[PDB]
Design a binder for this molecule. Structure first.
Ligand SMILES: *[C@@H]1O[C@H](CO)[C@@H](O[C@@H]2O[C@H](CO)[C@@H](O)[C@H](O)[C@H]2NC(C)=O)[C@H](O)[C@H]1NC(C)=O
Ligand SMILES: *[C@@H]1O[C@H](CO)[C@@H](O[C@@H]2O[C@H](CO)[C@@H](O)[C@H](O)[C@H]2NC(C)=O)[C@H](O)[C@H]1NC(C)=O
Ligand SMILES: *[C@@H]1O[C@H](CO)[C@@H](O[C@@H]2O[C@H](CO)[C@@H](O)[C@H](O)[C@H]2NC(C)=O)[C@H](O)[C@H]1NC(C)=O
Ligand SMILES: *[C@@H]1O[C@H](CO)[C@@H](O[C@@H]2O[C@H](CO)[C@@H](O)[C@H](O)[C@H]2NC(C)=O)[C@H](O)[C@H]1NC(C)=O
Ligand code: TYR
Lengths: 464, 470
């Protein structure tokens, strides 16, 4: 009993597209224009961010084709840097990052779904929390039932969000083709090079939030059909399409709303729909919520698989990484992920942990690519069907180092708090993983708990 | 490597009593999901609804800027109509939503037969230059209102001739200027126009006959409330700028009484708040009260209208040999050629633009807040009693940040004594509130401040805020 290989190229493309296209494209442009000033500067920032993301996606595609095992961005560190850094990353990932991200996406979905009912007065939180919890529970139940259903849902919602973006593109083209625009040929008016790079890089930073999630396919490798060919092809198909769609969407946004209207807006898509439709203007927010819905699925699935891998190496209790003999799904991992995600509904400052951990992704990516180069240097005997030309990873590493330096520059105090939280993961490693000769009264308790969970869920250990 | 295998689990987990619990827990999970959905639905249904917007126009959003004499605005030099393109950027800085240009038509003297409102006076420029200015202003999201007062050079606004000819000429002028692309009109000194009510109503009708985003402004000099009200008996959507407010109402109680009486008499309709029709604030106020009145006019329920130079406090009593109606703007220390050196550094726009405690910075902050906050945009207004000489009121629209303005018009320090006890429970003031700004430097910004021990320095204003809490 193992996890069947039932993810095709189309499913991988859908996963990447649905993960990347979330809610960033509907909110971030306000911040990008605020930190850039001129529309042309914003457009060039978005193009540069797209190129940077394409470079990183190619690097990760080659790396994941070299090491074909699930739990990516964590298995690479486990193989290269050893066990302790891998556990240090995994503890933070399962403790703060994943549940907070999933809950934030669920809250965005809940708030944008209910927006037409309360167009001006804010949506009550006591209902948004319930809607988010219902979404999380329904998606985790769907994932627990079967794997094919999750892929079908992801495909449908990726198609839905692509259709919404296409609708925005057509609306922008209709607006621009009917006559005067006066917002595109004077594009460098108010070209703010404020503090020169001292602000320009910050603009780039904002764009990066819209280009996040291209590495979530590596989480679900060794579950694809012929990964050696499909893994790079999916990324190659996905990334340029996303970049082009983002650029066209920004152009359509600029063809309708003035600069002062944009900087005074909290949701550019809502204003665009209000202007261009008037009646049936609720279409634009609803789709946005639907988009977030898909994102939640695209998270939970991957998250579960990560924890699955986390239990195969002994870094997590053995109850995880156990498969239902009939459904062939990791029920305990999904249940644990859902419980951890729902546990964050009591946090009234959920929008701060993201600020606490903003350098953690770039550091992990840089470490993974450094391990890529070191593994290429020391072990020139592995199979590499794809081999990116050198001097590309070193430039990406330099960019990641500059990015983490910028992240420290922006907000140092909670970056230090994040360092402390990360360092807090050593005692748990030394107690659970390092300490083998445990007292006899603890092994029996753990065994009884695992047996009870097995009997409740009807899950068997993985056999190869 | 910790737990049973497939065979042992199959043996020990298939007995009855272990398969019943799984189905029971599944049913419990689904029932809990249904209950959560029902709770969310009943919470959503049993919630207060939003309040519909009042369909604000373009002149309902911010302040109006008046440029009386066009020659003196650009300082000493050419007063060509295109020069405004160099100064227009500044209007955006001030975040003004309008611009009332002075009369720019041909005007020889009191002879009506030679004066026409159709042709632009050659000194100011040409029609093409005006069209370029209008297009540039429209591209900058700033509207232009054209003053159509026939006899502005002469002492009398009209020619003291028979009215009907002048009325026909001006009504012909409105059509042509509307076709040109102006966004509004203004007429001043209507007290010298007999039967002005009918003419004003007809001009409003012909202005609204083009579009619903067209504005007409009338100006008087009468401070009598009944005389002001008689003009608006037949007109509902007319902005009447008058000297009603500036009637030596230095004391706070008289000003509060005037404001409340006017708002009650007009039926809480939309109005225009200004001290005069063509005069600066300094012409009616001492230098110690300019900040207080600027804080007042940016929070009252209406459109604030300011003359040019009111953001930095010009006056005609500091530079001798100047007209009382057309002071020269102080752009720099070289603004005034005569007495070369009388102009200091703090009386110029560039000096105040870098000082964080000048009139210009306060004006910019107030204009930014007024044109962005919904409560200040179209919120309900309620003034409540306070100490002997304090004007205290609150602005609150539906659920946004409620604003509380307290002004001390007395010349000595005094407490607050904010005993309302009559405001509706939807906007009851709490124990603590923030602090956006104060007229006199010396108070920290942003820090919450208790409103029980409020001490006010002489001639001070406060702009506290507090969120909505049912
Ligand atoms: C102004 O237009 C209106 C609508 O066609 C007409 O008169 C209006 O309504 C009553 C009835 O005459 C008048 O008492 C109001 O003064 C008018 N309101 C306005 C200004 O719209 C009429 O066609 C036009 N002339 C008048 C009378 O103002
Ligand atoms: C408007 O102010 C002018 C002075 O600037 C005055 O107008 C006077 O009006 C009365 C009759 O109402 C007449 O004596 C003259 O028409 C004006 N007197 C003058 C200028 O000597 C008055 O202060 C205001 N007009 C009003 C309301 O009368
Ligand atoms: C003036 O506005 C008030 C506002 O309600 C109208 O009624 C007055 O309300 C005040 C405060 O409760 C009380 O003095 C009386 O109920 C009313 N007195 C006044 C000021 O008249 C009033 O009808 C409005 N118009 C009048 C006639 O002044
Ligand atoms: C401009 O600011 C200066 C700097 O404080 C001040 O100069 C004062 O001028 C007034 C006369 O109006 C006198 O009190 C003194 O000559 C100056 N007092 C000071 C040094 O504060 C004043 O605020 C402004 N200058 C003016 C208006 O003359
Ligand atoms: N791409 C996501 C943002 C994101 C950021 C980081 C991620 O790991 C995933 C997604 C969005 O646009 O909403």
């Amino acid at each position: 009993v193992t996890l069947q290989r039932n993810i095709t190229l189309l499913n991988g493309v859908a996963i990447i597209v649905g993960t990347i296209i979330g809610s960033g494209i509907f909110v971030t442009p306000t911040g990008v224009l605020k930190e850039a000033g001129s529309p042309g500067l914003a457009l060039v920032v978005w193009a540069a961010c797209g190129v940077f993301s394409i470079v990183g996606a190619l690097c990760y595609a080659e790396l994941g084709t070299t090491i074909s095992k699930s739990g990516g961005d964590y298995a690479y560190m486990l193989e290269v840097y050893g066990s302790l850094p891998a556990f240090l990353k995994l503890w933070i990932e399962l403790l703060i990052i994943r549940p907070s991200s999933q809950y934030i996406v669920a809250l965005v979905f809940a708030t944008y779904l209910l927006k037409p009912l309360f167009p001006t007065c804010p949506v009550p939180e006591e209902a948004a929390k319930l809607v988010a919890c219902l979404c999380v529970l329904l998606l985790t139940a769907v994932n627990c039932y079967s794997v094919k259903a999750a892929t079908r849902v992801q495909d449908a919602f990726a198609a839905a969000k692509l259709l919404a973006l296409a609708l925005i593109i057509l609306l922008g083209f209709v607006q621009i083709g009917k006559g005067d625009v006066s917002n595109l040929d004077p594009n460098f008016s108010f070209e703010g090079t404020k503090l020169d790079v001292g602000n320009i890089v910050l603009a780039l930073y904002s764009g990066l939030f819209a280009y996040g999630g291209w590495n979530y396919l590596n989480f679900v490798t060794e579950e694809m059909i012929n990964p050696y060919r499909n893994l790079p092809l999916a990324i190659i198909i996905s990334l340029p399409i996303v970049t082009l769609v983002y650029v066209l969407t920004n152009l359509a946004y600029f063809t309708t709303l003035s600069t002062e209207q944009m900087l005074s807006s909290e949701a550019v898509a809502v204003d665009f729909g209000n202007y261009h439709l008037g009646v049936m203007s609720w279409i634009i927010p609803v789709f946005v919520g639907l988009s977030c819905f898909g994102s939640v699925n695209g998270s939970l699935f991957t998250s579960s698989r990560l924890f699955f891998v986390g239990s195969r190496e002994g870094h997590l209790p053995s109850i995880l990484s156990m498969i239902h003999p009939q459904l062939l799904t990791p029920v305990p991992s999904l249940v644990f992920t859902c419980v951890m995600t729902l546990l964050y509904a009591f946090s009234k400052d959920i929008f701060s942990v993201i600020n606490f951990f903003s350098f953690f992704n770039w550091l992990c990516v840089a470490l993974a690519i450094i391990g890529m180069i070191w593994l290429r240097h020391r072990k020139p005997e592995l199979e590499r069907p794809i081999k990116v030309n050198l001097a590309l990873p070193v430039f990406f590493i330099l960019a990641c180092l500059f990015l983490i330096a910028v992240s420290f520059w922006k907000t140092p105090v909670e970056c230090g708090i994040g360092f402390t939280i990360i360092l807090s993961g050593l005692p748990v490693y030394f107690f659970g993983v390092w300490w083998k000769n445990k007292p006899k009264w603890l092994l029996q308790g753990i065994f009884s708990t695992t047996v009870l969970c097995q009997k409740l869920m009807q899950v068997v250990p993985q056999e190869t | 490597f910790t737990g049973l295998s497939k065979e042992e689990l199959l043996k020990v987990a298939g007995s009855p009593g272990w398969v019943r619990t799984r189905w029971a827990l599944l049913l419990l999970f689904w029932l809990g999901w249904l209950g959560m959905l029902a709770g969310a639905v009943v919470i959503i249904v049993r919630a207060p609804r939003c309040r519909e917007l009042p369909a604000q126009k373009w002149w309902h959003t911010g302040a109006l800027y008046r440029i009386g004499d066009l020659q003196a605005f650009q300082g000493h030099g050419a007063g060509n109509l295109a020069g405004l393109k160099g100064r227009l950027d500044y209007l955006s800085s001030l975040k003004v939503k309008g611009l009332v240009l002075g009369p720019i038509h041909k005007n020889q003297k009191d002879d009506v037969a030679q004066t026409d409102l159709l042709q632009i006076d050659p000194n100011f420029g040409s029609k093409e230059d005006f069209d370029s200015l209008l297009q540039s202003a429209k591209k900058k999201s700033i509207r232009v209102i054209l003053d159509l007062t026939p006899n502005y050079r002469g002492e009398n606004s009209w020619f003291s001739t028979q009215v009907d000819t002048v009325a026909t000429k001006v009504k012909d002028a409105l059509e042509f200027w509307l076709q040109a692309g102006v966004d509004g009109f203004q007429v001043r000194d209507i007290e010298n126009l007999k039967d002005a009510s009918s003419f004003l109503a007809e001009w409003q009708n012909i202005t609204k006959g083009f579009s619903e985003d067209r504005l007409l402004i009338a100006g008087t000099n009468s401070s009598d409330l009944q005389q002001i009200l008689s003009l608006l008996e037949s007109n509902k959507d007319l902005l009447l700028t008058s000297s009603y407010l500036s009637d030596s109402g230095s004391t706070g109680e008289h000003t509060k009484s005037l404001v409340t009486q006017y708002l009650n008499a007009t039926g809480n309709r939309w109005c225009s708040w200004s001290l005069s029709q063509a005069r600066l604030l300094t012409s009616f106020l001492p230098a110690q009260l300019l900040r207080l009145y600027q804080l007042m006019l940016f929070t009252l329920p209406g459109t604030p209208v300011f003359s040019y130079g009111d953001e930095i406090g010009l006056d005609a009593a500091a530079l001798p040999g100047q007209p009382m109606e057309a002071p020269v703007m102080l752009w720099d220390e070289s603004s005034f050629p005569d007495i070369p050196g009388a102009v200091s550094a703090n009386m110029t726009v560039k000096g105040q633009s870098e000082d964080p405690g000048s009139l210009l910075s306060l004006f910019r902050r107030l204009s930014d807040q007024r044109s962005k906050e919904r409560s200040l945009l179209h919120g309900d207004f309620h003034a409540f009693s306070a100490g002997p000489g304090l004007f205290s009121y609150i602005r609150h629209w539906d659920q946004n940040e409620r604003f509380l303005v307290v002004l001390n018009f007395g010349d000595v320090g005094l407490s607050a004594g904010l005993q309302a006890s009559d405001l509706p429970a939807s906007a009851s003031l709490p124990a603590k509130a923030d602090l956006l700004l104060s007229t006199q430097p010396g108070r920290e910004e942003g820090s919450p401040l208790e409103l029980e021990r409020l001490k006010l320095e002489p001639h001070e204003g406060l702009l506290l805020r507090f969120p909505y809490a049912a």
